[PDB]
Design an enzyme around this catalytic site. Structure first.
Site, PDB file in Angstrom:
ATOM      1  N   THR A 189       0.849  -1.220   0.000  1.00  0.00           N
ATOM      2  CA  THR A 189       0.000   0.000   0.000  1.00  0.00           C
ATOM      3  C   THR A 189       0.868   1.247   0.000  1.00  0.00           C
ATOM      4  O   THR A 189       1.137   1.827   1.049  1.00  0.00           O
ATOM      5  CB  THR A 189      -0.932   0.042   1.214  1.00  0.00           C
ATOM      6  N   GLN A 190       1.308   1.655  -1.188  1.00  0.00           N
ATOM      7  CA  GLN A 190       2.095   2.871  -1.314  1.00  0.00           C
ATOM      8  C   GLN A 190       1.312   4.119  -0.942  1.00  0.00           C
ATOM      9  O   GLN A 190       1.924   5.132  -0.586  1.00  0.00           O
ATOM     10  CB  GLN A 190       2.615   3.004  -2.746  1.00  0.00           C
TER      11      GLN A 190
END
Lengths: 233, 146, 240, 247, 229, 232, 212, 239, 233
Positions: G1-2
Site C-alpha cells: 500500500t504505497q
C-alpha cells in the site's frame, strides 16, 4: 520378487516392502532408550566401535534447548533429520520468539518423512529417532520409524536387541512418573544393560545420557562425565 | 486355469481336472462324500473349481499373529525341559514374519544349542540363539550402521 | 491378429497389428460399474435416462447419482468408473465456463464434446498416464440446430447420435433403438421419454419402479436442462 | 520409469554403441550415394527411389538440398530425420553468416552438424538420427570439397566415396578407377554414370531412377545445378556407345 | 514429470518398428482417394457408420485448413482431429507472419515435421494416421500425402487405407493427364466403389474439391447428383 | 530432462560403464609417446590411406595450446568433444591468469571432465584415452596420460590403444638415457617402437615433434621415410 | 500500500492490575470525509489477546483474515498450546518488517494487548517494523494529545485499576474528540482479563462542554 | 506384470494397484460414522500394540476445519497427509469465498486430490479411506466417505475398516433418522464393542467424537463423562 | 531395475555396499595419532618403472593444519578434496578462525550420499563416491585422526588402516600402538607395516609420508628425508 524393487509399487497384500526393509535398517543399529517422568525425560544410549582403536560413534544430538534425539540407523539420514529439526526450531524462535511445541515438531518430521514413500525413485529415511522434549505441556518422549509414523510413547527402546529392553521398561512403568532424576537414569541404564550381550558390562566408554526438564536445558553426559551416573548400578 | 496355447501336455491335466469338477457337483448328485483341499496359490485355480457349488466354504489361514506365535511356540516346546524364565511374549515379539512352521525350527534349534553347550535345561539365550539361526541372515563384512 | 511385441499390453503403444490394447481395456472398464444408460432425441425434446442402483439402505440415495449439469443448459450422463466420471465432469464444467468467459456466449454441445475428446486423445498418446474409464453423453438445445445428443469415450470418439445407449448393455439397446428409428422417426414428441424407458426396461428386463431411475430433459420451449423428479417419473412410469 | 527405458545411450560389454550400429545398418538399404571431386567441380549422384508412374514432379530436386549459396548435400537413411538435419544445417549456415558476414566454410559446417549428432548419441535417452550425409561446397580455404557424415558424428573428407546401398562395390570401383588430381568434371560425371549403372543392378540407368548434382564456380560465384532429363539421357547414350566400342 | 526417453528405437535390422505398426493401423482403416485433375483436385473417402443411429452430419472426415486447402485421412479418428487442429494453427501462424495464404507444399512440410517429432520425442507414440492434402496455390493444383513416419509424397493420384494396393492399381489404369474435374471426381467415386461392401448412398461417402474458386466440401445433394451417373 | 543413472556400481565394486569405455579404447589405433632431454615426440598409426580419404580432414594429433598438444585412442566423436573443451579452457586460462597454461593443469581439467561424465545422470562415459605432452614455461619436458575413469599419471614413455601392452613392454625394456641424448635418436626410437604393430611405415605412420619454443612439428612422409631408412 | 485510501485514526491503550484496556472510534475517513461511520477497529485475536489498528482499513481487514485463519488452524490441532500475546506481537513485528523490506508497506500502526499467565502485555508495531512494549500506548495524534495524560498519571501512580483505566481512557478520548480533526463521537473499548476479550457498544463522548 | 503401476489396466479392465491399496485398508481396525437428526458421530477402535504407549497415541479422528471431522483407516502416513490436504482446502476456501466450506465441496476436492494419485506411474494410490462429517443450520447434518479410488458418496451409516461387514450388518438396525447425537453415541460404542475380536487383538481404547446442534456446529472430542458412560453401557450390553 | 536408492532385504542400500567393496581395490594407507602429532603413510604402487612416481598425488593437504590420505579411485577423491578445501577457507573467511578437523570431516561426509535419480539437479551426482579418506590434523583440541567411508559415516580413530590389505595391517597396528607413542616411532611403525604389506620391497621412491604437528604445518617427507627415515627403518 518384483514387489520389493520400488517404494510406489503396492504388494498384493497391501504392504510396501521397501518401507519394511528400511525398518530393518533401523533395527540393525545399536540400542537406545527413552524415558519420561512427571519432571524429566532421559535418553540413554549404547555406542559401539568398529575396532578397538576407533572411537565409539556419537548417537545423541542437540536440536533445541528443550528437545533432544537419539538415532539408530544410517548416520547420514540422522544428520539430515537433525538439520531439519534444528532449522524448524530456529524458525519458530525467529518468528514467534517462543520454543516450538514438541508435538508439532514431531508432526512436521512425520510429514517430511512421508513424501519419500509415495514418489517413484525416492527411498525411505533409513533412521530411527527417539525425540525427548519439554514443552508447556511438560515432558514428552516420541519415536519415529522409517515409515512416516511417529508414536507418543512413555518409554521405548529401538535398535538391535532392543526387545529385552522394552520388556524391562514395560515391567517397571509404574515408577517412572514418580521417580527422581537419579532413579529415572538408573532405570534407563539398567534396561540398556539388559540389552548388552552377557559378558559385556556398562562402562564409561560405551554410554551417553541426555536429559531435559523443567529448569534444565538439554544436556549430554558422556565419557567420564557419565561416571557419576554409572557409579551406583 | 485353462488357456489357449499350442503347447500340448497341459491338456491332460486340465482334462482330469474337468473330471474332478464333474465328480464334485454334477449329474447324479453325490451327498455322501466330502472333499478338502489345500493350496498356497488360489490365484491360479479354475473358477469352475472355486465355484460356489463344488468348493463352497473357502477358509483363509493368516501368517500367525503375536498371540499365535506364542501359542505355537508353547505347543511345540511342551516336551522339552524348559526353565521358568522364558518370556514367550518376548519370543513372540522378536519373531516377526514367522510362519507357524517356524518355531519348530526355533524350539528344536534351541534344544540343539542346549545340547551343544552341554546343558540340561533351556534358557532365554538358548531361544534367542535359535532365532538368530532360523532367520538365516548374512553380514556385509562391516557394520557402518550406528 | 493377437501378437505382442514388448510392452504393447502395458503402456499405450501400438501392437504389431496396429492396435492400442490399453485403450481397448479402458473401454472394457466402462462396464465395471454394472450400469447402463440410454439417450433419445425427440422432435422438440432430448432425453437421457439412466439406472440408479441403491446397493443398500445405508447410502443416502440423494447423493448417489450419475446425472450432472455442465451448464444450466447442457446436462450429461456419466457411466463407468465413478472417480474418472467425476474428473471428466469437473473438466467439462471448467471448459464450459471458460468458453463463456472467453467468447461471450454459451458453449455448443458439439464443441464441448470435441474439447473433452481432445483431452482424452492426449491421454491416449502420452504413456505416462492411463486413459480414463468413463464415457459421457450430453444433451441440450442448439440455437439453429435443434436438440443435440452427443457422447464421448476413452479413445476420443465423439460421434453425435439420434438415440444412444452406453454401458454394459450397449449392443442390445443400440439394436432396439436402431429398429425404432427405422420405424417412423425414432419418437417425435416429448413422449420420447417413454421410448427410452421402454428400451431400458426391455434390455435389462427390469419393470422399473419410481425410485430406480433418473431422467434429465431439455425442451425447445424450456431449454434449461431439468432433472426429472420422482413424482413426474412415477407419472411417466404409470403412463405405460 | 526404468522398466520401459531402452538405454539408447549406454555402452555395450565390448565398448560399441549398439543403437549407432543399427543406425548405420539402416543406411545400407536406402539409395546409394556417390561422391566425386573433380579439379573443376564436385558432384553428387544418388538414386531416385520414388519410382512410380503416379508420383508428381515437384521442387528442383528430390534428394539434393541447398544449404547456402555455396553448399549442397544429399541424404541416405530416413526421410524425416533427413528433413530435421537439413533444417538445422541451414540454421547453422545462417548463424555463421550473421556473425561474420562471410559464407560458412565447409568443415565449419559439417563439424557443427556432426557435433549436434554426436551430442545426440552421447546423452539424452533418445534414439540417434539414422542418416548419413554427403556434402559439397567451395570456400576460400580448401576449394571444392566433398565431406561425409555418419550416425556416430564422425566425418571425413573423401576424394571419392559411397554411402548407402552397395557401398562396398561402389567404393571398390571408385578405388580402381580414380585418377587423383587427373579428373575433369566431364570425366567425373562419366565415371559416376558407369559406377551407378553397375550398382543400380535393377535394370539400367533409366535417366529417371537417378539424381545428379554439380557444384561449380562460374563468373566468380558458385553455381549449383541439377541435371535435366535430356543431358542425363545423352550422357547414358554416350556411356553405352563407349562400352560398345570398347567390346 | 513425464518420460524423457524415446519409445521408438532402432532394431537390429535398422528398422523403427513402432512406425511400421502405425503404418499397419493406417493400412487397416477406411479407404481414401485423391486425384489431381488438370483444373482441380479431388479427395473422397468412405464414411460408413455402424448403425442408423449415427448422424452423418455430426462429424466430417474431409476438413479444410484455409479457404483454399484442405485434407482427409485414413487411419484413426482422434489422431486425425489433432492433426487437423495443428494444421489449422500452423496455417494461421504462416498467415500472421506473411499476410498471404500458406502454400500447400509448405503446410505439408510443416505438418509432417510436426509428425516426425512424435517418432523421436520422449514418452510418445507415432500418429496412426496418413493424410492427403489438396490445395490450389500458384494457379496450380497440389496433392500431397503424409504418413506416420513424417515422410511426405507428392501424388498425381493415390488411394490409401484398406485395400489400397488394388486401388492404386485401378488408378494406375485410369489416370489421363488431360483429365477434367467432373471426370476426375467420377473416377474417384468409382475407385471407392471398387471395394465398398454395400450400396453407395449419398450418406455413406464424402468428397472435397479444390480449384480457382477455392477448396470446398460437396453438399450431399451435389454428391447424389454426381453419383447419378 | 533425462535423469537416469547410466553409470552405476556393481557387486565386487566395478563401474561397468567405465570398463566398457576402456574396452572401446582398446579398439583404436595405437598411439605412442616418449620424453627426452629436450624433445617430446608423439607417434600414431594410420589405419590406411585408402587412396581416397583426405588425410587433412582426418588428423589424429591435435594442438590444444601453442605449447601443449595431445593424442587420443578410442572413439572419435568423444575425442573431438574433449579437444574442443580443453581448447576453450586453455584460452580462458590465458585470459584470466595472463600466463601460459601448463600441461598438468590441462590434463587435470580433461581428467575432471571425464570423471564428471562418469558420475553424472543420463551420461555415457568417454571411451577415449589421451596423451598430453609439452613444455611448461620453465622449459621442462612433460608427459601425462588420461584414462576414461578420470585418472592421470606422468610417464617417461607410454603407449595407448590397440596393442598397448606390447609397445609398453618394448619401451620399458629399451628406455634409457642413451636414447634421448640425440633428438634424432628419440624420433627414431618412437618410429621403431610403433613399427612393432604397423606394417608399411612411412605411408602408414604419422609423427609429431615439439621443442622449447619451436612450434608443433608434423613430419612429412618423405622425411619420415628418410628417418626410417637412416634407422635401416 | 504505497498510498493509504480509507484510514482509521488514533488508537490508545493502557494496562492495569489484571489486564489491559484499548479504545478506538468507529470511523474510516477518506481524506477529511467521514465516509464510513460504523466500522469497528478493534479485534480479538484469541481468548487472551486483542488488537487495535490505525491507518489503512483494507490492510487491517486483510491482517484480520490472516491472523484469524492462523488462530483457527492452531486451535484445530488441539494439542494444548495457544499463542500468547507475546507470540502475536512477534508475529506482527516480523510480518510488518518483511513487508517493509519488500518496499510494499502494510499501512497500519497497531497496538497489541493481552493478558496471560498472570501478566499483562501491551505492545506496539509500525509499518516500518519498530516494536516495543510499554505500560501505555497511543497511535496517531493520540501519541501527542493523549499520551501525556496517561504517562503523567501512570508515573504518579504506577499501578491502576479497572475503573481508573476506564476513566482515563474516556478522558483521553474526549480530548481527542475536542482537538482531533479526523475523529468521531462514537467509540468502542475492549478489555481482557482472566475471563476473556470484551468489546463494548458504541459509547458516546457525551460529555462535550462547549462554553464559548 | 499387469499390477505394477496404476498407469496400466488389467486385461479385464481393472487398475490393480488401487485394488491392493484398498485391500490394505481392510487390515486396519474398524471405524464408524452415524448420521442423525442433530448431527454426526464418529467412533474408532484403536488397538494398543504395546503397553508402553500413551493414552491418545496416534489419534484416528482429526479436525480439518472448525465444523468438520475426519475418521481414517489404513496407513497413518497417508491419513495424515490427506488430513493436511483437507485442512489446506478448507483454509483456502475460507480465504477466497469468505465463509466456511460446505462439506460436500470439501469431499469433492479431497477426493479429486486422491483420485489424481491413481492415474500415473510416478506416484502410488493412498492407502487410506476416510469419512467426513459436519453440521450447519443451513446444510444440516452430512456424512460422506472417500475410498482410495476417489469415489465420494453420502452415507446414513458406514464402517470403514477390518470388520466393516460385521459393523455394516450392525449399523443397519439403528434407524438413526429419528434420534440425536446423544443416543447415537451410546449406539456407536455399542457397535464398536460388538465388532471387536478379543481372540486376535489384545485391547483397545475408544476414540469418539461428534458434530451437531449440541456443539453450535463445532466438531470436538466427545467429553470424558459421556464417553465413559457410553463405554459402560456398551460393556453391559456385551453381557 | 533396482534403482540406486534401494534397500536390500537386510536394510542396506545396495549401492553403498558395492561402494564399500571398491575400497579393497585401492592401495594401503595408514594413519597413527600421537600426542606429539599425527602421521599418514600410503603406498604409491608403481605399476611400471616408466612412470614418474612423483606424479601420483595421493596425499594432499586440506589446510596448513589438516592432511588427507585416500584409498579407492583416483578420480572420486578430487571433488571431495575441493569441497573440503573450500569449506575450510569459507570458515576462515566468515569466522577468521581455523576450521577444525571434525567439522571438515562432517562437511565432506554430508557431501557424500546426496546422490539420486529423480528431481535433484541438472547434473547432480548419481552413484556414491567409492573412496575412503583419512583426515588427520592438529586442531585447538590437539592431534586428531578421522576416518571416512562411502556411507557418510566418519569416526575419529587412534590408528586406522584402509585399503587392499587393511585387514592384517589393522592387527599389526593394534598389537604395536599404545597411548604414549612418539611421532618418530609412529613413522617407524607405519613404514614397517607398509613394508610388510606391499608386494614390492619398500623404497623411498614408492611411498609417500606426511606428518602434522602443533608447531610445524602439514609436512611432506622429501626423497632424502624419506631415505633418512628408511635407512634405519
Amino acid at each position: 520378487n518384483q514387489y520389493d524393487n520400488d517404494v510406489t509399487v503396492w504388494s498384493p497384500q497391501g504392504r510396501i516392502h521397501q518401507i519394511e526393509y528400511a525398518m530393518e535398517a533401523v533395527k540393525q543399529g545399536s540400542a537406545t532408550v527413552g524415558l519420561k517422568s512427571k519432571t524429566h525425560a532421559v535418553l540413554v544410549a549404547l555406542k559401539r566401535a568398529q575396532s578397538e582403536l576407533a572411537a565409539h560413534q556419537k548417537k545423541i544430538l542437540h536440536v533445541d534447548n528443550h528437545i533432544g534425539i537419539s538415532i539408530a540407523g544410517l548416520t547420514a539420514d540422522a544428520r539430515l533429520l537433525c538439520n531439519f529439526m534444528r532449522q524448524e526450531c530456529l524458525d519458530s524462535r525467529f518468528v514467534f520468539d517462543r520454543p516450538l511445541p514438541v508435538s508439532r515438531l514431531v508432526s512436521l518430521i512425520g510429514s517430511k518423512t512421508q513424501i519419500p514413500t509415495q514418489r517413484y525413485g525416492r527411498r525411505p529415511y533409513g533412521v530411527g529417532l527417539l525425540i525427548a522434549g519439554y514443552d508447556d505441556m511438560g515432558p514428552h518422549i516420541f519415536q519415529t520409524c522409517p515409515s512416516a509414523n511417529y508414536f507418543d510413547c512413555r518409554a521405548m527402546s529401538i535398535g538391535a536387541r532392543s526387545q529385552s529392553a522394552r520388556t524391562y521398561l514395560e515391567r517397571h512403568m509404574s515408577e517412572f512418573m514418580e521417580c527422581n532424576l537419579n532413579e529415572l537414569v538408573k532405570h534407563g541404564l539398567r534396561a540398556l544393560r539388559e540389552t548388552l550381550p552377557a559378558e559385556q558390562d556398562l562402562t564409561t566408554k560405551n554410554v551417553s545420557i541426555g536429559i531435559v526438564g523443567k529448569d534444565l536445558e538439554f544436556t549430554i553426559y558422556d565419557d567420564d562425565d557419565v561416571s557419576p551416573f554409572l557409579e551406583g548400578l | 486355469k485353462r488357456f489357449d496355447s499350442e503347447k500340448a501336455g497341459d491338456r491332460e491335466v486340465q482334462r482330469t481336472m474337468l473330471e474332478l469338477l464333474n465328480q464334485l457337483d454334477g449329474f447324479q448328485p453325490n451327498t455322501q462324500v466330502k472333499v478338502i483341499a489345500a493350496t498356497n496359490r488360489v490365484d491360479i485355480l479354475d473358477p469352475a473349481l472355486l465355484r460356489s457349488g463344488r468348493l463352497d466354504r473357502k477358509i483363509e489361514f493368516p501368517m500367525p499373529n503375536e498371540e499365535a506365535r506364542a501359542r505355537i511356540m508353547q505347543i511345540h516346546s511342551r516336551k522339552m525341559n524348559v526353565s521358568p524364565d522364558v518370556n514367550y511374549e518376548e519370543l513372540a515379539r522378536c519373531t516377526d514374519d514367522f510362519n507357524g512352521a517356524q518355531c519348530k525350527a526355533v524350539c528344536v534349534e534351541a534344544g540343539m544349542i542346549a545340547l551343544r553347550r552341554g546343558a540340561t535345561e533351556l534358557t532365554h539365550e538358548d531361544y534367542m540363539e535359535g532365532i538368530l539361526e532360523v532367520q538365516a541372515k548374512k553380514k556385509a563384512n562391516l557394520q557402518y550402521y550406528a | 491378429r493377437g501378437s505382442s511385441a514388448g510392452f504393447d499390453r502395458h503402456i499405450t503403444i501400438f501392437s504389431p497389428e496396429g492396435r492400442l490394447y490399453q485403450v481397448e481395456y479402458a473401454f472394457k472398464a466402462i462396464n465395471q460399474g454394472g450400469l447402463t444408460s440410454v439417450a433419445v432425441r425427440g422432435k422438440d425434446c432430448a432425453v437421457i435416462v439412466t439406472q440408479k442402483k441403491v446397493p443398500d439402505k445405508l447410502l443416502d440415495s440423494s447423493t448417489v447419482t450419475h446425472l450432472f449439469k455442465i451448464t444450466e443448459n447442457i446436462g450429461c450422463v456419466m457411466t463407468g468408473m465413478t472417480a474418472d466420471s467425476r474428473s471428466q465432469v469437473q473438466r467439462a464444467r471448467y471448459e464450459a465456463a471458460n468458453w463463456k468467459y472467453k467468447y461471450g456466449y454459451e458453449i455448443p454441445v458439439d464443441m464441448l464434446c470435441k474439447r473433452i475428446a481432445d483431452i482424452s486423445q492426449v491421454y491416449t498418446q502420452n504413456a505416462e498416464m492411463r486413459p480414463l474409464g468413463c464415457c459421457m453423453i450430453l444433451i441440450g438445445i442448439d440455437e439453429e440446430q435443434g436438440p443435440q445428443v452427443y457422447k464421448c469415450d476413452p479413445a476420443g470418439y465423439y460421434c453425435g447420435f439420434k438415440a444412444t445407449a452406453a454401458g454394459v448393455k450397449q449392443t442390445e439397446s443400440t439394436s432396439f433403438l436402431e429398429k425404432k428409428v427405422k420405424k417412423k422417426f425414432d419418437w417425435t414428441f416429448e413422449q420420447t421419454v417413454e421410448t427410452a424407458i421402454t428400451c431400458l426396461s426391455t434390455v435389462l428386463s427390469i419393470d422399473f419402479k419410481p425410485s430406480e431411475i433418473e431422467v434429465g430433459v431439455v425442451t425447445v420451449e424450456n431449454p434449461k436442462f431439468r432433472i426429472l423428479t420422482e413424482a413426474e417419473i412415477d407419472a411417466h412410469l404409470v403412463a405405460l | 520409469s526404468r522398466r520401459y527405458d531402452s538405454r539408447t545411450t549406454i555402452f555395450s560389454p565390448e565398448g560399441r554403441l549398439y543403437q549407432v550400429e543399427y543406425a548405420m545398418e539402416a543406411i545400407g538399404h536406402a539409395g546409394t550415394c556417390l561422391g566425386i571431386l573433380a579439379n573443376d567441380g564436385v558432384l553428387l549422384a544418388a538414386e531416385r527411389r520414388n519410382i512410380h508412374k503416379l508420383l508428381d514432379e515437384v521442387f528442383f530436386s528430390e534428394k539434393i538440398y541447398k544449404l547456402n549459396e555455396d553448399m549442397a548435400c544429399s541424404v541416405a537413411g530416413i526421410t524425416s530425420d533427413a528433413n530435421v538435419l537439413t533444417n538445422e544445417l541451414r540454421l547453422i549456415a545462417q548463424r555463421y553468416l550473421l556473425q561474420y558476414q562471410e559464407p560458412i566454410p565447409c568443415e565449419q559446417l559439417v563439424t557443427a552438424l556432426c557435433d549436434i549428432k554426436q551430442a545426440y548419441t552421447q546423452f539424452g535417452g533418445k534414439r540417434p538420427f539414422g542418416v548419413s550425409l554427403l556434402y559439397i561446397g567451395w570456400d576460400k580455404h580448401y576449394g571444392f570439397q566433398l565431406y561425409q557424415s555418419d550416425p556416430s558424428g564422425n566425418y571425413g573428407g573423401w576424394k571419392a566415396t559411397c554411402i548407402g546401398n552397395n557401398s562396398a562395390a561402389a567404393v571398390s570401383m571408385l578405388k580402381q578407377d580414380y585418377k587423383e588430381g587427373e579428373m575433369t568434371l566431364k570425366s567425373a560425371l562419366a565415371l559416376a554414370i558407369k559406377v551407378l549403372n553397375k550398382t543400380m543392378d535393377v535394370s539400367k540407368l533409366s535417366a529417371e531412377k537417378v539424381e545428379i548434382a554439380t557444384l561449380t564456380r562460374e563468373n566468380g560465384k558458385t553455381v549449383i545445378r541439377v541435371l535435366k532429363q535430356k543431358e542425363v539421357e545423352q550422357l547414358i547414350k554416350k556411356h553405352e556407345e563407349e562400352e560398345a566400342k570398347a567390346e | 514429470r513425464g518420460y524423457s526417453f524415446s519409445l521408438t528405437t532402432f532394431s537390429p535390422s535398422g528398422k523403427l518398428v513402432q512406425i511400421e505398426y502405425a503404418l499397419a493401423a493406417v493400412a487397416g482403416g477406411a479407404p481414401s482417394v485423391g486425384i489431381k485433375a488438370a483444373n482441380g483436385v479431388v479427395l473422397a473417402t468412405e464414411k460408413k457408420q455402424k448403425s442408423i443411429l449415427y448422424d452423418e452430419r455430426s462429424v466430417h472426415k474431409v476438413e479444410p485448413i484455409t479457404k483454399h486447402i484442405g485434407l482427409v485421412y485414413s487411419g484413426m479418428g482422434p489422431d486425425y482431429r489433432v492433426l487437423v487442429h495443428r494444421a489449422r494453427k500452423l496455417a494461421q501462424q504462416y498467415y500472421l507472419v506473411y499476410q498471404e495464404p500458406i502454400p500447400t507444399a509448405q503446410l505439408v512440410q510443416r505438418v509432417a515435421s510436426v509428425m516426425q517429432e512424435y517418432t523421436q520425442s520422449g514418452g510418445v507414440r507415432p500418429f496412426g494416421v496418413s493424410l492427403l492434402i489438396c490445395g490450389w496455390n500458384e494457379g496450380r493444383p497440389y496433392l500431397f500425402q503424409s504418413d506416420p513416419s513424417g515422410a511426405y509424397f507428392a501424388w498425381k493420384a493415390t488411394a490409401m487405407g484398406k485395400n489400397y494396393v488394388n486401388g492404386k492399381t485401378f488408378l494406375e489404369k485410369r489416370y489421363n493427364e488431360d483429365l477434367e474435374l467432373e471426370d476426375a471426381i467420377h473416377t474417384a467415386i468409382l475407385t471407392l466403389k471398387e471395394s465398398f461392401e454395400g450400396q453407395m448412398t449419398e450418406d455413406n461417402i464424402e468428397v472435397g474439391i479444390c480449384n480457382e474458386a477455392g477448396f470446398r466440401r460437396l453438399t450431399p445433394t451435389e454428391v447424389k447428383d454426381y453419383l447419378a451417373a | 530432462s533425462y535423469d537416469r543413472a547410466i553409470t552405476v556400481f556393481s557387486p565386487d565394486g566395478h563401474l561397468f560403464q567405465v570398463e566398457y569405455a576402456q574396452e572401446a579404447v582398446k579398439k583404436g589405433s595405437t598411439a605412442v609417446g616418449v620424453r627426452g632431454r629436450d624433445i617430446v615426440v608423439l607417434g600414431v598409426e594410420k589405419k590406411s590411406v585408402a587412396k581416397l580419404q583426405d588425410e587433412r580432414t582426418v588428423r589424429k594429433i591435435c594442438a590444444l595450446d601453442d605449447n601443449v598438444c595431445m593424442a587420443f585412442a578410442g572413439l572419435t566423436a568423444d575425442a573431438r568433444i574433449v579437444i574442443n573443451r580443453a581448447r576453450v579452457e586453455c584460452q580462458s586460462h590465458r585470459l584470466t591468469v595472463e600466463d601460459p597454461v601448463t600441461v598438468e593443469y590441462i590434463t587435470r581439467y580433461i581428467a575432471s571432465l571425464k570423471q564428471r561424465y562418469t558420475q553424472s545422470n543420463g551420461r555415457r562415459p568417454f571411451g577415449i584415452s589421451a596423451l598430453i605432452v609439452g613444455f611448461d614455461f620453465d622449459g621442462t619436458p612433460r608427459l601425462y596420460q588420461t584414462d576414461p575413469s578420470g585418472t592421470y599419471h606422468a610417464w617417461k614413455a607410454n603407449a595407448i590403444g590397440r596393442g598397448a601392452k606390447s609397445v609398453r613392454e618394448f619401451l620399458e625394456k629399451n628406455y634409457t638415457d642413451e636414447a634421448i641424448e640425440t633428438d634424432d635418436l628419440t624420433i627414431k626410437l618412437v618410429i621403431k617402437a610403433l613399427l612393432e604393430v604397423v606394417q608399411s611405415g612411412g605411408k602408414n605412420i604419422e609423427l609429431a615433434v615439439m621443442r622449447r619454443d619451436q612450434s608443433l612439428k608434423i613430419l612429412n612422409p618423405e622425411e619420415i621415410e628418410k628417418y626410417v631408412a637412416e634407422i635401416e | 500500500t504505497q498510498n493509504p485510501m480509507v484510514t482509521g485514526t488514533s488508537v490508545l491503550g493502557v494496562k492495569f492490575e489484571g489486564g489491559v484496556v484499548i479504545a478506538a472510534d468507529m470511523l474510516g475517513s477518506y481524506g477529511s470525509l467521514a465516509r464510513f461511520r460504523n466500522i469497528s477497529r478493534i479485534m480479538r485475536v484469541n481468548n487472551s489477546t486483542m488488537l487495535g489498528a490505525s491507518g489503512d482499513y483494507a490492510d487491517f481487514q486483510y491482517l484480520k483474515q490472516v491472523l484469524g485463519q492462523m488462530v483457527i488452524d492452531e486451535e484445530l490441532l488441539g494439542d494444548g498450546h495457544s499463542y500468547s500475546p507475546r507470540a502475536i506481537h512477534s508475529w506482527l513485528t516480523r510480518a510488518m518488517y518483511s513487508r517493509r523490506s519488500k518496499m510494499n508497506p502494510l499501512w497500519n500502526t497497531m497496538v497489541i494487548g493481552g493478558y496471560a499467565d498472570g501478566e499483562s502485555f501491551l505492545g506496539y508495531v509500525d509499518m516500518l517494523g519498530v516494536a516495543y512494549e510499554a505500560p501505555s500506548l497511543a497511535t496517531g495524534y493520540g501519541a501527542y494529545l493523549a499520551q501525556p495524560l496517561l504517562r503523567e498519571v501512570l508515573e504518579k501512580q504506577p499501578v491502576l485499576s479497572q475503573t481508573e483505566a476506564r476513566d482515563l481512557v474516556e478522558r483521553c478520548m474526549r480530548v481527542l474528540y475536542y482537538r482531533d480533526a479526523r475523529s468521531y463521537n462514537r467509540f468502542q473499548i475492549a478489555t481482557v482479563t482472566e475471563k476473556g476479550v470484551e468489546i463494548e457498544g458504541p459509547l458516546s463522548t457525551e460529555t462535550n462542554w462547549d462554553i464559548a | 506384470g499387469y499390477d505394477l503401476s496404476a498407469s496400466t489396466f488389467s486385461p479385464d479392465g481393472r487398475v490393480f494397484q488401487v485394488e491392493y491399496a484398498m485391500k490394505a485398508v481392510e487390515n486396519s481396525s474398524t471405524a464408524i460414522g452415524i448420521r442423525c437428526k442433530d448431527g454426526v458421530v464418529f467412533g474408532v477402535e484403536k488397538l494398543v500394540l504395546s503397553k508402553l504407549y500413551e493414552e491418545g497415541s496416534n489419534k484416528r479422528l482429526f479436525n480439518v476445519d472448525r465444523h468438520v471431522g475426519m475418521a481414517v483407516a489404513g496407513l497413518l502416513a497417508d491419513a495424515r497427509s490427506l488430513a493436511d490436504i483437507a485442512r489446506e482446502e478448507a483454509s483456502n476456501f475460507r480465504s477466497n469465498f469468505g465463509y466456511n466450506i460446505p462439506l460436500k465441496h470439501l469431499a469433492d476436492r479431497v477426493a479429486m486430490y486422491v483420485h489424481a494419485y491413481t492415474l500415473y506411474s510416478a506416484v502410488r494410490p493412498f492407502g487410506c479411506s476416510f469419512m467426513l462429517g459436519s453440521y450447519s443450520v443451513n446444510d444440516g447434518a452430512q456424512l460422506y466417505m472417500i475410498d482410495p479410488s476417489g469415489v465420494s458418496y453420502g452415507y446414513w451409516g458406514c464402517a470403514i475398516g477390518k470388520a466393516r461387514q460385521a459393523a455394516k450388518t450392525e449399523i443397519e438396525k439403528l434407524q438413526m433418522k429419528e434420534m440425536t447425537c446423544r443416543d447415537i453415541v451410546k449406539e456407536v460404542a455399542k457397535i464398536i464393542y460388538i465388532v471387536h475380536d478379543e481372540v486376535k487383538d489384545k485391547a483397545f481404547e475408544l476414540e469418539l467424537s461428534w458434530v451437531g446442534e449440541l456443539t453450535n456446529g463445532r466438531h470436538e472430542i466427545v467429553p470424558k463423562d459421556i464417553r465413559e458412560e457410553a463405554e459402560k453401557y456398551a460393556k453391559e450390553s456385551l453381557k | 531395475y533396482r534403482g540406486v536408492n534401494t534397500f536390500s532385504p537386510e536394510g542396506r542400500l545396495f549401492q553403498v555396499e558395492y561402494a564399500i567393496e571398491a575400497i579393497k581395490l585401492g592401495s594401503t594407507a595408514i594413519g597413527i595419532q600421537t600426542s606429539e602429532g599425527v602421521c599418514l603413510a600410503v603406498e604409491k604402487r608403481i605399476t611400471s618403472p616408466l612412470m614418474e612416481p612423483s606424479s601420483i598425488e595421493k596425499i594432499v593437504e586440506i589446510d596448513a593444519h589438516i592432511g588427507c590420505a585416500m584409498s579407492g579411485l583416483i578420480a572420486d577423491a578430487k571433488t571431495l578434496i575441493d569441497k573440503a578445501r573450500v569449506e575450510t577457507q569459507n570458515h576462515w573467511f566468515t569466522y577468521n578462525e581455523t576450521m577444525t578437523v571434525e567439522s571438515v570431516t562432517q562437511a565432506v561426509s554430508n557431501l557424500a550420499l546426496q546422490f539420486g535419480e529423480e528431481d535433484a539437479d541438472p547434473g547432480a551426482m548419481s552413484r556414491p563416491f567409492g573412496v575412503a579418506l583419512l583426515f588427520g590434523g592438529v586442531d585447538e583440541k590437539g592431534p586428531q585422526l578421522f576416518h571416512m567411508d562411502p556411507s557418510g559415516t566418519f569416526v575419529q580413530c587412534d590408528a586406522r588402516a584402509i585399503g587392499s590389505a587393511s585387514e592384517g595391517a589393522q592387527s599389526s597396528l593394534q598389537e604395536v600402538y599404545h597411548k604414549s607413542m612418539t611421532l618418530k616411532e609412529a613413522i617407524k611403525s607405519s613404514l614397517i607395516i607398509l613394508k610388510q604389506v606391499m608386494e614390492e620391497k619398500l623404497n623411498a621412491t614408492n611411498i609417500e609420508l606426511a606428518t602434522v604437528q602443533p608447531g610445524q604445518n602439514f609436512h611432506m617427507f622429501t626423497k632424502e628425508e624419506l631415505e633418512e627415515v628408511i635407512k634405519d627403518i
